[PDB]
């Protein structure tokens, strides 16, 4: 059961989660400029919402 080292692998999951979450963020980028402006509107929406809950 110790032919492969368990705790080295189970503390590598920060790197696994970071790399996979980084790949998802790269896939979130599109290149189509309409969604860039939609990102600007949706940042304005959340900033005003986050300011009105304060």
């Amino acid at each position: 059961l110790l032919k492969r080292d368990p705790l080295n692998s189970m503390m590598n999951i920060p790197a696994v989660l970071s790399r996979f979450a980084g790949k998802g963020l790269l896939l979130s980028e599109n290149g189509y400029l309409r969604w860039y402006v939609a990102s600007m509107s949706i940042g304005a929406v959340v900033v005003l919402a986050l300011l009105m809950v304060l």
């Binding site: 059961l1 110790l2 032919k3 080292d5 705790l7 080295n8 692998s9 503390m11 590598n12 790197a15």
Partner: protein, 504 residues
Amino acid sequence: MLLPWLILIPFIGGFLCWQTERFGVKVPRWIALITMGLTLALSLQLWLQGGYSLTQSAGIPQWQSEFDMPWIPRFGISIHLAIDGLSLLMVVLTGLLGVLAVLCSWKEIEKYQGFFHLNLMWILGGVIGVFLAIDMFLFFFFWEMMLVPMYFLIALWGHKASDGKTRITAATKFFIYTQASGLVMLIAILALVFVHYNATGVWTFNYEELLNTPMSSGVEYLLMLGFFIAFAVKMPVVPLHGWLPDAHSQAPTAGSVDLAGILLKTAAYGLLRFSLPLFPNASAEFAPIAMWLGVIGIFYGAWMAFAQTDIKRLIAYTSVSHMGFVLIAIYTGSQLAYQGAVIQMIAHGLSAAGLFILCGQLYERIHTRDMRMMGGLWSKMKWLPALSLFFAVATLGMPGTGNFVGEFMILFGSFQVVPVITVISTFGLVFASVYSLAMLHRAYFGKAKSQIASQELPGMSLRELFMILLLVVLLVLLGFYPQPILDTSHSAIGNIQQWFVNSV
């Protein structure tokens, strides 16, 4: 006085080897040997000239030599190099290991060799600077800059850019697992200094006035966890040690001598010097968690050592078993236990260095790394396996080796303070025997027909045998006659223990 020079010779030698790289190619090997000879000369001069048998109760501030210099005056960051007795043992050990590193790299010419040696002296000088460090920022800067040049060693010299397994897993885990915790202890340093700045009103980064800073309970506990996390990823402790076998199995075995024999020293040095005295009540509360992690480390490293099939990962998993004794030693209230840890720690370096030199030596003889593939090489090699038998014998508690007196005075002091966690701990010796015999029988006992490549074997040169003979005789004298270095470390160990006793 001698301390600025004694941390700078490694950096000066790297500049000069790379300067004379244009002049010649056989120069940096001979330049590097002499420069490490000068390092041990100054280190041994401090051992002999200094009053190593000094007063056992001269307070917490006591130093044979001391250097101060303003570096960043806005926070009081100063080059506060100061050498104690046990710090001087650390310096002489790394000077000797540096001689072994530059001797194992002899007759190793490549496309570039001056780059390798300026990096080699840079990393060894970084460890010396950690060992002489009283200012917290200087300690942290040296702690983190010895950590960058080994990455280039594992990357460009783990294998010459052919396979991608020498960077993206081995070297990268080595780098991240240390630096995240280094930043953790930096913010721990800053939280401690800020609570001291509220108390008194001066921006200071010095150890003597941060030693007795007034802190309310429930506050210094978090800073003690913050110090211990960075001190638990460098020496192998139970939750975070996955970098160690990958780092040792991929770096060249000279880089592995640096990675095992002396990088493992500095964390327990910091647990003795920077974590115990600053946080007495937090460490007194945290003690039983440390004992549980210590016993788990010994048993865990031996099982993982028994279960492994290669050799570099095998000795790399002996190291995590060895350091569990040291951690239980530090987190107890006994003077004898701490003095056992020091001799165990010096012997740990001396018993890992010879094995790694010889494992690398065996690989370049046979061009095969897997242990179970070979077997029965005793009829072929003439001096490698006999000397290797004693080093595997010196790994466990065999008397006449320094490891026995080391681990075993810890157990005396540990049973003096607390019975039940010690009586669990002693059983690692039985487990130390089983992975020691597993190494010996799988590698050397058997028939040479286990491998086809075990039928044409080279000879062994004189200088490798010379540097193996010196280590085996040096390790036997430490096992038989350990009094001189215990008399050296008595006062430094004593005031740390008296402060840990009296401050609670």
